[PDB]
Design a protein around this nucleic acid. Structure first.
Ligand SMILES: Nc1nc2c(ncn2[C@@H]2O[C@H](COP(=O)(O)OP(=O)(O)OP(=O)(O)O)[C@@H](O)[C@H]2O)c(=O)[nH]1
Ligand SMILES: [Mg+2]
Lengths: 170, 1072
RNA sequence: GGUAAACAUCCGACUGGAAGCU
RNA sequence: GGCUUUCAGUCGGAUGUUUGCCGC
């Protein structure tokens, strides 16, 4: 146990935020879409080359009628992940919303954008159409909670950014 | 009846705390959530509660939840409210800005957000007509101080976002606030501007005046707000406002680029402004940035890119400034080219000087970024003639040399760039991918640079060569030397090829040319990777030998010696890749040399002939691939005899051993019989790792195939008519009067055709499961795809094995696997090339089509996807396309008929497997996609030009025609979205447009339209298909419903169709 | 040399966002 | 309805550049 940082997870309903976290924590894949209600805070520890680093992950429900305080969960956050699904074109349309909301409440925090479920037959959201991250100078990683493709890449980059050590290894 | 104000506030505090509690029972969570929802929907005293919690005394968490309530009320409960209730809520929130919040520097960013959201929500409920004095009200609040003014800025930016960018309101209400915005836009943007201007000023003198930190820090924070909120408007608003007061907005934004605390904001405003698209005339005023005044602050800010180590704050500003400079060049390039009033800016030299600052900076990212604008600058009709640009090229190319050196790894520490590469890319893999793709684009841009200043480019490529020649598994690898050499080569070769296009026949530094050519020649390495650059530098420098043919022998010496070996070590150690790379590279330069300067190599022909003869003398010495490259080169020189019989005699003599082995009696059996064949090659046998005799066999058979292909591909009549006549190549002339050529290799190749088709047939038969089961278990996947070729087409990348290593040893199964794939493609290659080479001596061959059908098209039912694709492309496409129409009858027709029928049937069945739905299956799905594209392409190229002759011609045929229509309209139903538009717009129509008048079998008409509909049914979602398919559906219902009546039969089965609306449209076209 | 895959510059095919015109 | 320039998508064609792979 050591530093501990507040991490905010935002995005449309069903883009697999809860499943991404449940995996990292337990290491199992969840199948049913049980809608999240408000937030579920989860601690994640990462034994780095610089010691253990902890992540209080605020798994906020991005379903319209289920977010609790919404903006209020962003309170004093120090890093964020904005997630969307490549099966739903709509979720990438709504990324700039999840973004405006975050930077407004807590400016200057490192944010990683994440296109989930790349393991699914055909991506409606083509990897070349993803340009938002470049207009708002954020990192991107297409990922999958069933496939584990880039499983730790977003955490590693955040961890790298907060501690200010590009050589930081998980 | 429900509750008292005091009591609720208490529980609401208990509920917000439990919700924010990272470690609270999940059950207590839900009850807290359920409390709040109910409260926010049913409670009648929400506003008194919201205003209470919202007050300055509480904990931030609680205040924010109070404010969130007052926002939820405006947003969901306004309609269930009295006029009085609203007026009360409004006045309270306005009071809140006035002095119900903490002062400026204390006060969480999130509270300002929450308070701001409530105002905006009321503005959207009723701004223009029920809330007319809003703009004045805000203007009044903003005069009260910085805490207030910042708050107004938060509101105007949220409001600008929600109504214009996110546009999150019903269409109707949205539209009216935007028109109102525009109407007030001079007022609003004037307000943003003066706020910024004054706040900056106050921050100006007060900054460094010790006893006043709180006010400097405050006036600053408003600046930042202004810049932020300005950035909300700057892209969407009319250009009038940007330009407004002799362009004051753009002026300040430049001046602010040199203020550490406001720069990133101002850079971001500049960026959005200057990326503004649309009407060309609207951008014209953007040219003010080129003005004396603006350019000064721009350059000053760009000079500070000294690159003195990575300071995160500064580097992030530089990434921004840079994009500003990029967009501003593309603006310049886009406004000038159009001659429309824009004349080259006076201050263009300053823009360049400033842009160059980023071009020479350590950062990979920063350098790469400039490329595209340089590429636009260098191809400008006008600016490449500008002398300020000419002047700048020496400094530019000087930068490019360094850019060429693959230095700056995220992991290493060798160069300043390494630091920043860490900031920008996770791993070296992300760095490589960026680097390599960057250099592709860098490639094209550097040529344009040389094209504009050929003297200098050559001189500096020259000097880098002289330099490299005298400086610096323990011989060579990825050392600084090799990396320096590869960059140097690459620059030079790029520079020379460019120079021999721009500089006239006479401006050439011949003397300096041969100067360098000599030095390259005299230079010496036992190191494969270095020699390989040497060989490239020779070929680059080789156009010099045109002036000084004395040098040819040295040149031949250099190349041929490299062909033979690399004296790493002979029959004692394994052949490293870098070794077999230089040999290949030499053999390649041999062909390029002969193909490009052959009058030149001509006098030396006997000597080369003799040399190659000697080299092949020991059949075990060179690689089959090496052997043939040399033969190919020899063929290319003989083209220069420019004389039919002369070449006829040479080639028959050159081919004389190959003919021997191929037409041999026992080879015939090997080629014709499957068991004979499996035998010759060693799939029959289980020393479970001594294939030994099998390898040499299958190398001799490859040798012949490689040769036949070599000759066919390279043999050629004189390209000049007057010359083609004289050497006796012209057979007569066409109806249209085009000469008909005979090719020297015809008699010789035609003799080998029967054994080729023999082998082709046999090879295809091996794919029968009862032939394949005849292979031995060691070699059962002899005819499957190399794992190389698999991850290839799945995009799954590879590691780079070291060229000083032979770790992957050539497995007996992998050895055969490579053989089959190559033999398969090579046979078809020869047939592919037979048409365009032989002409009408191949096409008129007796019963060709039948021979082809029984050989090439023999076993298709069992031939896999990855074989058929190669076949179609390499063999069928060219066979057909290069056929003179005289025999569209003879052979094109009898072949394409059954082919298209089959292909179509194969594909539909393949598509139904896919429509039915780890890596092993997923892979095969990809191959269906690529095959389908290949087939559709084949069909298109065939009859689309409206149709070609063989379009018309194949249509005047029962079977061909049916097969073309079926396939084409069936394509719309496959799940591949790439084919939908292609086939629809280019193909489906002109096919039906050919078979209007006459027999349109009733059953055919109904099917056609149902199939277009399945198209709309499959795709749908995709805007490309749909538009294109609708239009195509429309064309069929319009050319076909004045005649046939069963078209409507189909329409009525479509879900939700008002028959009444159908009737109206149906009769509209059946009257006038 | 050959082959496949990426990207870039230019001149059409239609969906949709401002106008010029008979 | 008849005739056109500008701005994003989905392609299509033509050059050009780069990166992989090629002992059978
Ligand atoms: N195939 C595939 N399915 C996934 C993946 N990630 C999540 N899912 C599925 O997506 C659905 C919803 O995932 P959740 O994590 O519950 O969605 P969420 O972000 O929590 O939804 P909200 O919290 O309500 O915003 C579930 O049905 C999962 O099975 C993935 O990477 N691949
Ligand atoms: Mg969730």
């Amino acid at each position: 146990p050591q530093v501990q940082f507040k991490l905010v997870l935002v995005g449309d309903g069903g883009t697999g935020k809860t499943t991404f976290v449940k995996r990292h924590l337990t290491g199992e894949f969840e199948k049913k879409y049980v809608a999240t209600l408000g937030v579920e805070v989860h601690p994640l520890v990462f034994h780095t080359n610089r010691g253990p680093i902890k992540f209080n992950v605020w798994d906020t429900a991005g379903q319209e009628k289920f977010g609790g305080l919404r903006d209020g969960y962003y309170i004093q956050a120090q890093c964020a992940i904005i997630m969307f699904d490549v099966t739903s074109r709509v979720t990438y349309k709504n990324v700039p919303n999840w973004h405006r909301d975050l930077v407004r409440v807590c400016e200057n925090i490192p944010i990683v954008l994440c296109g989930n479920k790349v393991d699914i037959k055909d991506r409606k959201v083509k990897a070349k159409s993803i340009v938002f991250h470049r207009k708002k100078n954020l990192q991107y990683y297409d990922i999958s909670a069933k496939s584990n493709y880039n499983f730790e890449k977003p955490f590693l980059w955040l961890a790298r950014k907060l501690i200010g050590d590009p050589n930081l290894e998980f | 009846a429900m509750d008292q104000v005091n009591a609720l506030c208490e529980q609401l505090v208990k509920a917000v705390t439990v919700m924010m509690d990272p470690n609270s029972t999940q059950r207590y969570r839900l009850e807290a959530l359920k409390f709040c929802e109910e409260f926010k929907e049913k409670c009648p005293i929400c506003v008194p509660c919201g205003l209470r919690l919202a007050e300055k005394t509480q904990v931030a968490i609680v205040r924010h939840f109070g404010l969130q309530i007052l926002e939820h009320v405006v947003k969901f409960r306004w309609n269930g409210m009295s006029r009085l209730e609203k007026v009360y809520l409004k006045n309270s929130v306005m009071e809140l800005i006035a002095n119900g919040t903490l002062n400026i520097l204390e006060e969480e960013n999130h509270i300002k957000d929450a308070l701001s959201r409530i105002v905006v929500e009321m503005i959207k409920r009723e701004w223009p007509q029920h809330w007319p004095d809003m703009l004045i009200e805000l203007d009044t609040l903003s005069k009260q101080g910085e805490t207030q003014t910042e708050l107004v800025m938060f509101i105007l930016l949220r409001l600008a976002e929600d109504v214009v960018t996110f546009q999150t309101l019903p269409p109707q209400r949205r539209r009216d606030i935007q028109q109102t915005l525009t109407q007030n836009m001079e007022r609003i943007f004037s307000f943003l501007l003066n706020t910024l201007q004054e706040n900056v000023n106050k921050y100006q003198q007060v900054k460094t005046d010790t006893s006043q930190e709180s006010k400097a820090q405050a006036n600053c924070r408003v600046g930042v707000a202004a810049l932020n909120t300005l950035a909300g408007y700057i892209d969407w608003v009319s250009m009038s406002h940007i330009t407004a007061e002799n362009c004051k907005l753009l002026e300040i934004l430049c001046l602010l680029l040199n203020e550490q605390e406001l720069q990133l904001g101002a850079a971001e405003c500049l960026l959005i402004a200057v990326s503004r698209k649309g009407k060309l005339e609207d951008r014209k005023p953007l040219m003010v940035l080129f003005g004396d005044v603006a350019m000064h602050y721009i350059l000053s800010a760009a000079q500070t890119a000294d690159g003195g180590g990575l300071v995160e704050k500064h580097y992030v500003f530089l990434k921004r400034l840079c994009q500003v400079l990029c967009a501003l060049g593309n603006q310049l390039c886009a406004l000038l080219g159009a001659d429309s009033d824009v004349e080259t800016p006076s201050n263009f030299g300053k823009y360049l000087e400033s842009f160059l600052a980023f071009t020479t900076h350590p950062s990979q990212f920063l350098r790469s970024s400039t490329q595209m604008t340089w590429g636009a600058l260098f191809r400008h009709e006008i600016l490449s003639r500008d002398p300020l640009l000419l002047a700048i090229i020496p400094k530019y190319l000087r930068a490019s040399m360094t850019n060429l050196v693959k230095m700056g790894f995220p992991s290493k520490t060798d160069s300043p760039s390494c630091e920043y590469s860490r900031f920008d890319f996770d791993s070296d893999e992300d760095f490589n991918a960026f680097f390599n793709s960057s250099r592709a684009q860098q490639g094209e841009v550097m040529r344009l640079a040389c094209r504009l200043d050929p003297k200098t480019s050559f001189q500096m490529a020259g000097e880098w060569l002289k330099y490299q020649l005298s400086t610096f598994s323990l011989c060579s690898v990825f050392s600084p030397s090799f990396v320096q050499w590869e960059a140097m080569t690459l620059f030079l070769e790029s520079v020379i090829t460019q120079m021999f296009r721009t500089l006239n026949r006479e401006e050439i530094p011949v003397n300096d040319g041969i100067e360098l050519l000599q030095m390259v020649l005299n230079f010496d390495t036992k190191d494969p990777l270095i020699l390989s650059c040497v060989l490239t530098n020779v070929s680059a420098l080789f156009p010099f030998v045109t002036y000084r043919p004395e040098f040819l022998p040295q040149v031949f010496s250099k190349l041929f010696s490299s062909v033979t070996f690399e004296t790493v070590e002979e029959s004692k150690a394994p052949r490293t890749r870098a070794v077999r790379n230089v040999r290949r590279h030499a053999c390649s330069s041999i062909i390029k040399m002969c193909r490009d300067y052959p009058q030149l190599v001509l006098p030396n022909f006997d000597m080369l002939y003799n040399h190659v003869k000697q080299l092949l003398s020991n059949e075990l010495l060179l690689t089959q691939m090496e052997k043939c490259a040399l033969m190919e080169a020899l063929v290319l020189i003989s083209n220069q005899f420019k004389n039919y019989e002369r070449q006829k005699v040479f080639l028959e003599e050159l081919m004389a051993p190959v003919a021997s082995i191929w037409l041999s009696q026992d080879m015939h059996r090997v080629l014709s019989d499957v068991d004979a064949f499996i035998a010759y090659v060693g799939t029959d046998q289980k020393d479970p790792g001594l294939e030994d005799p099998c390898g040499l066999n299958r190398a001799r058979m490859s040798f012949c195939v490689y040769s036949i292909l070599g000759v066919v591909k390279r043999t050629c009549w004189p390209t000049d008519l007057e010359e083609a006549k004289a050497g006796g190549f012209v057979v007569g002339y066409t109806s249209s009067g085009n000469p008909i050529f005979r090719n020297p290799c015809t008699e010789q190749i035609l003799k080998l055709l029967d054994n080729l088709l023999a082998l082709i047939r046999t090879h295809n038969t091996l794919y029968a499961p009862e032939m394949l089961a005849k292979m031995a278990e060691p070699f059962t996947k002899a005819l499957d795809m190399l794992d190389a070729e698999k991850s290839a087409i799945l995009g799954l990348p590879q590691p780079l094995l070291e060229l000083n290593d032979s770790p992957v040893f050539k497995t007996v199964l992998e050895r055969m696997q490579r053989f089959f794939s190559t033999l398969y493609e090579n046979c078809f290659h020869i047939l592919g090339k037979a048409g365009p080479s032989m002409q009408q001596d191949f096409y008129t061959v007796e019963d060709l089509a039948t021979q082809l059908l029984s050989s090439a098209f023999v076993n298709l039912n069992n031939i896999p996807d990855y074989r058929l694709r190669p076949m179609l492309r390499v063999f069928v496409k060219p066979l057909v396309l290069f056929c003179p129409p005289e025999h569209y009858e003879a052979l094109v027709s009898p072949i394409l008929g059954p082919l298209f029928t089959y292909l179509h049937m194969r594909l539909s069945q393949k598509w139904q497997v896919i429509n039915q739905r780890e890596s092993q299956e997923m892979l095969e799905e990809q191959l269906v996609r690529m095959l389908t594209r290949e087939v559709m392409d084949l069909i298109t190229v065939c009859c689309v030009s409206e149709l070609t002759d063989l379009g018309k011609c194949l249509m005047k045929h029962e079977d061909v025609c049916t097969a073309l229509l079926i396939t084409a309209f069936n394509s719309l139903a496959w799940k591949d979205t790439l084919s939908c538009q292609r086939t629809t717009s280019q193909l489906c129509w002109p096919l039906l447009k050919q078979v209007l008048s006459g027999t349109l079998l009733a059953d055919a008409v109904t099917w056609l339209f149902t199939s277009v509909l399945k198209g709309l049914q499959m795709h749908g979602q995709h805007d490309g298909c749909m538009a294109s398919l609708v239009h195509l559906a429309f064309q069929i219902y319009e050319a076909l419903r004045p005649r046939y009546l069963e078209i409507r039969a189909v329409m009525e089965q479509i879900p939700e169709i008002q028959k009444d609306s159908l009737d109206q449209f149906d009769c509209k076209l059946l009257n006038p």
